[PDB]
Design an enzyme around this catalytic site. Structure first.
Site, PDB file in Angstrom:
ATOM      1  N   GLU A  76      -3.565  13.249   1.050  1.00  0.00           N
ATOM      2  CA  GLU A  76      -4.746  12.803   1.774  1.00  0.00           C
ATOM      3  C   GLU A  76      -5.488  13.996   2.357  1.00  0.00           C
ATOM      4  O   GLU A  76      -6.648  14.242   2.011  1.00  0.00           O
ATOM      5  CB  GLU A  76      -4.338  11.772   2.832  1.00  0.00           C
ATOM      6  CG  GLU A  76      -3.809  10.535   2.124  1.00  0.00           C
ATOM      7  CD  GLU A  76      -3.813   9.306   2.962  1.00  0.00           C
ATOM      8  OE1 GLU A  76      -3.387   9.318   4.134  1.00  0.00           O
ATOM      9  OE2 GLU A  76      -4.414   8.325   2.460  1.00  0.00           O
ATOM     10  N   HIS A 130       1.935   8.925   0.649  1.00  0.00           N
ATOM     11  CA  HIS A 130       0.787   8.704  -0.220  1.00  0.00           C
ATOM     12  C   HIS A 130       0.997   9.633  -1.411  1.00  0.00           C
ATOM     13  O   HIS A 130       1.448  10.769  -1.226  1.00  0.00           O
ATOM     14  CB  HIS A 130      -0.523   9.086   0.512  1.00  0.00           C
ATOM     15  CG  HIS A 130      -0.724   8.348   1.798  1.00  0.00           C
ATOM     16  ND1 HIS A 130      -1.394   7.149   1.879  1.00  0.00           N
ATOM     17  CD2 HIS A 130      -0.264   8.606   3.044  1.00  0.00           C
ATOM     18  CE1 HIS A 130      -1.393   6.729   3.137  1.00  0.00           C
ATOM     19  NE2 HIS A 130      -0.673   7.575   3.858  1.00  0.00           N
ATOM     20  N   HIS A 146       3.875  10.986   5.927  1.00  0.00           N
ATOM     21  CA  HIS A 146       3.376  10.727   7.274  1.00  0.00           C
ATOM     22  C   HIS A 146       4.504  10.174   8.123  1.00  0.00           C
ATOM     23  O   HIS A 146       4.996   9.072   7.858  1.00  0.00           O
ATOM     24  CB  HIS A 146       2.216   9.740   7.238  1.00  0.00           C
ATOM     25  CG  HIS A 146       0.992  10.337   6.644  1.00  0.00           C
ATOM     26  ND1 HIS A 146      -0.064   9.591   6.151  1.00  0.00           N
ATOM     27  CD2 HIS A 146       0.655  11.637   6.484  1.00  0.00           C
ATOM     28  CE1 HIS A 146      -0.990  10.419   5.697  1.00  0.00           C
ATOM     29  NE2 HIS A 146      -0.586  11.663   5.898  1.00  0.00           N
ATOM     30  N   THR A 176      -5.406   6.579   8.259  1.00  0.00           N
ATOM     31  CA  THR A 176      -6.038   6.756   6.958  1.00  0.00           C
ATOM     32  C   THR A 176      -6.041   5.481   6.131  1.00  0.00           C
ATOM     33  O   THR A 176      -6.528   5.502   4.995  1.00  0.00           O
ATOM     34  CB  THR A 176      -5.354   7.851   6.141  1.00  0.00           C
ATOM     35  OG1 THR A 176      -4.046   7.396   5.774  1.00  0.00           O
ATOM     36  CG2 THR A 176      -5.250   9.153   6.912  1.00  0.00           C
ATOM     37  N   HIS A 178       0.787  -1.225   0.000  1.00  0.00           N
ATOM     38  CA  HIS A 178       0.000   0.000   0.000  1.00  0.00           C
ATOM     39  C   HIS A 178       0.823   1.279   0.000  1.00  0.00           C
ATOM     40  O   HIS A 178       0.294   2.328  -0.377  1.00  0.00           O
ATOM     41  CB  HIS A 178      -1.089  -0.006   1.100  1.00  0.00           C
ATOM     42  CG  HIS A 178      -0.615  -0.357   2.486  1.00  0.00           C
ATOM     43  ND1 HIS A 178      -0.265   0.583   3.437  1.00  0.00           N
ATOM     44  CD2 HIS A 178      -0.462  -1.565   3.084  1.00  0.00           C
ATOM     45  CE1 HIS A 178       0.077  -0.030   4.556  1.00  0.00           C
ATOM     46  NE2 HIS A 178      -0.037  -1.332   4.368  1.00  0.00           N
ATOM     47  N   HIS A 230       6.083   6.987   5.835  1.00  0.00           N
ATOM     48  CA  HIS A 230       5.659   6.471   4.544  1.00  0.00           C
ATOM     49  C   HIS A 230       5.012   7.630   3.801  1.00  0.00           C
ATOM     50  O   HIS A 230       4.836   8.722   4.356  1.00  0.00           O
ATOM     51  CB  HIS A 230       4.660   5.323   4.717  1.00  0.00           C
ATOM     52  CG  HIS A 230       3.414   5.731   5.422  1.00  0.00           C
ATOM     53  ND1 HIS A 230       3.273   5.713   6.794  1.00  0.00           N
ATOM     54  CD2 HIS A 230       2.287   6.292   4.935  1.00  0.00           C
ATOM     55  CE1 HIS A 230       2.079   6.193   7.112  1.00  0.00           C
ATOM     56  NE2 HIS A 230       1.466   6.560   6.000  1.00  0.00           N
TER      57      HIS A 230
HETATM   58  N1  N8A Z   1      -1.598   6.616   6.922  1.00  0.00           N
HETATM   59  S1  N8A Z   1      -1.454   6.882   8.550  1.00  0.00           S
HETATM   60  O1  N8A Z   1      -2.806   7.418   9.130  1.00  0.00           O
HETATM   61  O2  N8A Z   1      -0.194   7.745   8.862  1.00  0.00           O
HETATM   62  C1  N8A Z   1      -1.134   5.339   9.381  1.00  0.00           C
HETATM   63  C2  N8A Z   1      -0.250   5.330  10.450  1.00  0.00           C
HETATM   64  C3  N8A Z   1      -0.002   4.157  11.127  1.00  0.00           C
HETATM   65  C4  N8A Z   1      -0.645   3.006  10.727  1.00  0.00           C
HETATM   66  O3  N8A Z   1      -0.407   1.824  11.424  1.00  0.00           O
HETATM   67  C5  N8A Z   1      -1.530   3.023   9.657  1.00  0.00           C
HETATM   68  N2  N8A Z   1      -2.227   1.840   9.216  1.00  0.00           N
HETATM   69  C6  N8A Z   1      -1.454   0.710   8.791  1.00  0.00           C
HETATM   70  O4  N8A Z   1      -0.257   0.738   8.813  1.00  0.00           O
HETATM   71  N3  N8A Z   1      -2.196  -0.438   8.362  1.00  0.00           N
HETATM   72  C7  N8A Z   1      -1.489  -1.627   7.916  1.00  0.00           C
HETATM   73  C8  N8A Z   1      -2.424  -2.654   7.271  1.00  0.00           C
HETATM   74  C9  N8A Z   1      -3.452  -3.264   8.232  1.00  0.00           C
HETATM   75  C10 N8A Z   1      -3.107  -3.485   9.558  1.00  0.00           C
HETATM   76  C11 N8A Z   1      -4.050  -4.039  10.415  1.00  0.00           C
HETATM   77  C12 N8A Z   1      -5.304  -4.348   9.905  1.00  0.00           C
HETATM   78  C13 N8A Z   1      -5.570  -4.099   8.569  1.00  0.00           C
HETATM   79  N4  N8A Z   1      -4.654  -3.573   7.775  1.00  0.00           N
HETATM   80  C14 N8A Z   1      -1.795   4.194   8.984  1.00  0.00           C
HETATM   81 ZN    ZN Z   2      -0.280   7.583   5.871  1.00  0.00          ZN
END
Ligand code: N8A
Ligand code: ZN
Length: 257
Positions: free
Chosen positions: A103, A93, A116, A195, A61, A91
């Site tokens: 975003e 976007h 981010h 997000t 992603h 990371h």
């Molecule tokens: N894009 S963001 O809001 O900075 C952000 C920051 C920290 C995070 O852990 C996330 N979300 C993330 O990394 N998700 C990983 C994939 C996932 C993890 C658990 C369940 C479903 N999908 C987003």
């Molecule tokens: Zn992010």
């Protein structure tokens, strides 16, 4: 499994993650004339001098640079925050074209990309616990516009060819994230969410007013990454952004006038 395509993208996420329709979802549009200046907000304290980067990873992603968060090495404090937040990863976007990719938006303007820097509140001990708390994470968001190159991004850009497809990682030590920061730390702040799934409502968002500039060559290298794994049909990793969500019962505060 969730993604950014027609059949698995942001409009589908609520089926697996019903909090997608929650009361404090991110990102949001930052209406600059409606954000209120809050004189009680403190300057952000960004202490990245002792940061220890570890690895860079294509997670299907985005691409992520991870840090040693087992000690207070790179921490965010002050601003709207109580206590100390450790940097875990950053990371990005980004878009398929320069007019989209961020975003958050600013008066409906979309930037080419958004960085981010993800931090978690040390009072909760580990990031998994922090994600279950309303003040568990602080994400520092930084807009990217296209024009002059950002020299401090080049070390990232040059390794992306080694993590082209989902699941690939590489050692990425001695990277200094201070090279990604704009001059000003003026910011907007509001309570929000991750997000991407699981969309947990655990984030104090801190979005910097000043974007950084990156070159067209730098962002083109982001757009050569793949969502797919090696050997699968190639789908370029572009437009990995969630659109703005309803602000609902929230006020965005500005640290500046
Ligand atoms: N894009 S963001 O809001 O900075 C952000 C920051 C920290 C995070 O852990 C996330 N979300 C993330 O990394 N998700 C990983 C994939 C996932 C993890 C658990 C369940 C479903 N999908 C987003
Ligand atoms: Zn992010």
């Amino acid at each position: 499994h969730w993604g950014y395509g027609k059949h698995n993208g942001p409009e589908h996420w609520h089926k697996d993650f019903p909090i997608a329709k929650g009361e404090r979802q991110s990102p949001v549009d930052i209406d600059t004339h409606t954000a209120k200046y809050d004189p009680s907000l403190k300057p952000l304290s960004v202490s990245y001098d002792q940061a220890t980067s570890l690895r860079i990873l294509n997670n299907g992603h985005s691409f992520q640079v991870t840090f040693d968060d087992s000690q207070d090495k790179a921490v965010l404090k002050g601003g709207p925050l109580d206590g100390t937040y450790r940097l875990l990863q950053f990371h990005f976007h980004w878009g398929s074209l320069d007019g989209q990719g961020s975003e958050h938006t600013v008066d409906k303007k979309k930037y080419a990309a958004e960085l981010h820097l993800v931090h978690w509140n040390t009072k909760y001990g580990d990031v998994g616990k922090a994600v279950q708390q309303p003040d568990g994470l602080a994400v520092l968001g930084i807009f990217l516009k296209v024009g002059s190159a950002k020299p401090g991004l080049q070390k990232v850009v040059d390794v992306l060819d080694s993590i082209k497809t989902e699941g690939k990682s590489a050692d990425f030590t001695n990277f200094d994230p201070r090279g990604l920061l704009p001059e000003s730390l003026d910011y907007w702040t509001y309570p929000g969410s991750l997000t991407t799934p699981p969309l947990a409502e655990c984030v104090t968002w801190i979005v910097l007013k000043e974007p950084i500039s990156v070159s067209s060559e730098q962002v083109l290298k982001f757009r050569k990454l793949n969502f797919n794994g090696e050997g699968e049909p190639e789908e370029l990793m572009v437009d990995n952004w969630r659109p703005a969500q309803p602000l609902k019962n929230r006020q965005i505060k500005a640290s500046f006038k």
